[PDB]
Write a protein that binds this ligand. Structure first.
Ligand SMILES: O=N[O-]
Ligand SMILES: O=N[O-]
Ligand SMILES: O=N[O-]
Ligand SMILES: O=N[O-]
Ligand SMILES: O=N[O-]
Ligand SMILES: O=N[O-]
Ligand SMILES: O=N[O-]
Ligand SMILES: O=N[O-]
Ligand SMILES: O=N[O-]
Ligand SMILES: O=N[O-]
Ligand SMILES: O=N[O-]
Ligand SMILES: O=N[O-]
Ligand SMILES: O=N[O-]
Ligand SMILES: O=N[O-]
Ligand SMILES: O=N[O-]
Ligand SMILES: [Cu+2]
Ligand SMILES: [Cu+2]
Ligand SMILES: [Cu+2]
Ligand SMILES: [Cu+2]
Ligand SMILES: [Cu+2]
Ligand SMILES: [Cu+2]
Lengths: 332, 332, 332
């Protein structure tokens, strides 16, 4: 009887940060209550000032990472304020039935709904908006995030031993398809209905104009670089709701990787790069061994360095000359 | 001595259906006899009426699924009637030697041939036409299918326990490259030789115009939706002879997935989405838990909803409110 | 104390050949000394005579395969002669820290440097140039190769039994983005600085003009076909520093495949085709069972047969009619 279970209210945080949770479940199964408010908003996505009309869960691209344990119930109150213009819904790849929830969560502006589903499978999973007939437009406008369903006894390695992270980050990777005129400059639009056909045309090229982490070129750099210390164990959850990606930590590895995100499977060890298929979340665990700057990229390096799919870690601590050293510095 | 083995003649069926077979082999090794007749034919592939000249095995895109057991012999009589115009052959990725058979099966119009090969490796595998110098043109004109080589003791899970499907479907995914003029409309051609250079030009864009299941937009919908009941175990074989895909059951999962199709490997568990590389067949096993409509898609959602890579399941049975429910239906 | 370890100097060979090494380590850990000299040079990459300005390690595309054992130290002397024009460096995906070495190895023309790193993880790994702000340009100009870090006790199968190759080949796959004018012909450039913006424009299409093995269309064919004999065990290392590929041996299989290249993981068995993500090296082991010509391809068959991603094996020995035979040769 679900009414007999504890309820716990989660207050979400903005990516790449993740709301507080316990890796090993400290309670029995619970109804975990989340609220998200849809926000349609202008977002500047590149250094040139390109501005799009983003469609967001909770004001961010990606939407926030939700975290529960296997066999918890996820109860989401989804709010579509009357300041928005479009119909929206939500599909959880973690859920079973009704198109992941999408068939049950269609909200016009000025409406809300509450969905509950049982998180029966452990893993990281995409969630995204999916209104009938408009699905890729909403997803590729930024309306996607992820949910992590932890095993009740936390993560395990390929031998069944515990893997415990000290820090977790959520990197959402977004492909945008900003319409171009025949000279190649972006077009802008006066209403969503006036934008729709050229959004479809742009999408049908299958060639993103921008591929970004955390909603914009450079978002995970500078004062917003990811951080760690030598010796810290970091889990990086990475999602891509629409297109394949191939994450890579420049100067590091994925020590344990669930490339397709599902924790009942043993992780892949020692990865340089891994393929997260479009429509999937994956997760990589790494223990930092060296300080300094790292780049975390999609290793289509054009996508990373020309289109935006690159962020940084800043790692503090002691340099290990046994692992790497300059024997003779560059010289004539 | 192969002449001492039983022969069994298989009568193939049109995809997405699969000819009758036994999961666990009820006999010793056999020579399994198949016949396919090549048919070049016009096919309408979209709702707009776009018509291409398809190149088919047995009149369908994809060609039919062949099913044998490991260490059976596959004996294929391949017929190229004189009503066709082109040379064709067949390459089985299940086979060993002679370019998968292609070097031994070149048939002009008005010819036939018979190939035998031993199915030494269990899995689902692509087969496709591959005439020297014209390979991607034939494949991307629809001339590809798949063969399933079952282990003699049927499928097994990651722990070695049996996995028995109640139903099986074969979804062939086809990328088409319909030539476009500089305004973007499709061109049509008067002979295959007159079409060849612009087919090559279209292919070299690496951007399909259409990506379809079972040969056309919407083919696996309406009266031709896939079906199941709550509690039924379904295997979905999915092939893509030329380009990567990322299948996903919207509202469901791949409970056990051989993404790259080879049954000696343990399946991946609990997948949301999986990557089937171009040139591969994969297979996903799912037990339905909820009734209703599901969409089965390539989860590049542009490819699914704009280019055609989407089909439906219609599932009968009882709704489980424990797994999912609307707590508060959409309202003001 | 690294100074107490043996040093061994390796003399590299041109791909697809691989310098001599032992699979099972015959010594304790060593400092393995390599030297590479960067060469910027013109290369003709197709049958039409298209000529690009390639950026190479050691004069080849790909750069040579380096081979060490786990927990050896790799000490690379990297030389940038004054006959080159550009700044270069090197990033090893096998290494830990300093962007894989790139932060420590920036060499102007007329400079050299020596980097040492400990090869702590077994696998095949990409290495590539990565100068800040110019990364995809150098990589997609050919400036990438691979390193194999063997387990000290050699390769093992999924059950922990030895896998010993008789021959090894290194296939580097290169995506080139030759700039096109609005009629579609390639452009040529008078200096690297004058080429840079249109190189970036070409790359941003995400559509390679050429995808080649060993630096050119047809490079691994004819007198330069790969060779083997029936019964020989062959390891094919395959890298792609920037874009996904899907290798396939036409007429064969990958009997044991590390698609993402890391030997602590069990190999995938019986693969037809496998996905090597951009930014990764993979390795496939096969025992030949039939003589004749094989094609080794990227199984996007457009990429293989139209853009260049195809090579050949020529295999000597006895034909096995049990595995495959023509029962009735093509006839009227
Ligand atoms: O708790 N049964 O899904
Ligand atoms: O968190 N200690 O494994
Ligand atoms: O190529 N990714 O959908
Ligand atoms: O080494 N990563 O580009
Ligand atoms: O979902 N396996 O990582
Ligand atoms: O039955 N030997 O392949
Ligand atoms: O088919 N019964 O497992
Ligand atoms: O991107 N698939 O070949
Ligand atoms: O949830 N599938 O788009
Ligand atoms: O081929 N492994 O699914
Ligand atoms: O040998 N420690 O990396
Ligand atoms: O090299 N003999 O296994
Ligand atoms: O589609 N490969 O990057
Ligand atoms: O069978 N390979 O194209
Ligand atoms: O890296 N696993 O092949
Ligand atoms: Cu929406
Ligand atoms: Cu989805
Ligand atoms: Cu054909
Ligand atoms: Cu093939
Ligand atoms: Cu360089
Ligand atoms: Cu790299």
């Amino acid at each position: 009887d679900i009414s007999t279970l504890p309820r716990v209210k989660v207050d979400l945080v903005k990516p790449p940060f993740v709301h507080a949770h316990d890796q090993v479940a400290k309670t029995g199964p619970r109804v975990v209550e989340f609220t998200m408010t849809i926000e349609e908003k202008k977002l500047v996505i590149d250094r040139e000032g390109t501005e799009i009309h983003a469609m967001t869960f909770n004001g961010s691209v990606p939407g926030p990472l939700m975290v529960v344990h296997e066999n918890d119930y996820v109860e989401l109150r989804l709010i579509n304020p009357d300041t928005n213009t479009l119909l929206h819904n939500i599909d959880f790849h973690a859920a079973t039935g009704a198109l992941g929830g999408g068939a049950l969560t269609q909200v016009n502006p000025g409406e809300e709904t509450t969905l509950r589903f049982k998180a029966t499978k452990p893993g990281v999973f995409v969630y995204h908006c999916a209104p009938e007939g408009m699905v890729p437009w909403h997803v590729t406008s930024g309306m996607n995030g992820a949910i992590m369903v932890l095993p009740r006894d936390g993560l395990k390695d390929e031998k069944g031993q515990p893997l415990t992270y000290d820090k977790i980050y959520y990197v959402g990777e977004q492909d945008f398809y900003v319409p171009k005129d025949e000279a190649g400059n972006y077009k802008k639009y006066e209403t969503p209905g006036e934008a729709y056909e050229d959004a479809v045309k742009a999408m049908r090229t299958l060639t993103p104009t921008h591929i970004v982490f955390n909603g914009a070129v450079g978002a995970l750099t500078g004062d917003h670089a990811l951080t760690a210390a030598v010796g810290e164990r970091v889990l990086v959850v990475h999602s891509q709701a629409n297109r394949d990606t191939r994450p890579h930590l420049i100067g590091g590895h994925g020590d344990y990787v669930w490339a397709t995100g599902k924790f009942r499977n043993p992780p892949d060890l020692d990865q340089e790069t891994w393929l997260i298929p479009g429509g999937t979340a994956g997760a990589a665990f790494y223990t930092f061994r060296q300080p300094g700057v790292y780049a975390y990229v999609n290793h289509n390096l054009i996508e990373a360095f020309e289109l935006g799919a690159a962020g940084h870690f800043k790692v503090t601590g002691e340099w290990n000359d046994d692992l790497m050293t300059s024997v003779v510095k560059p010289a004539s």
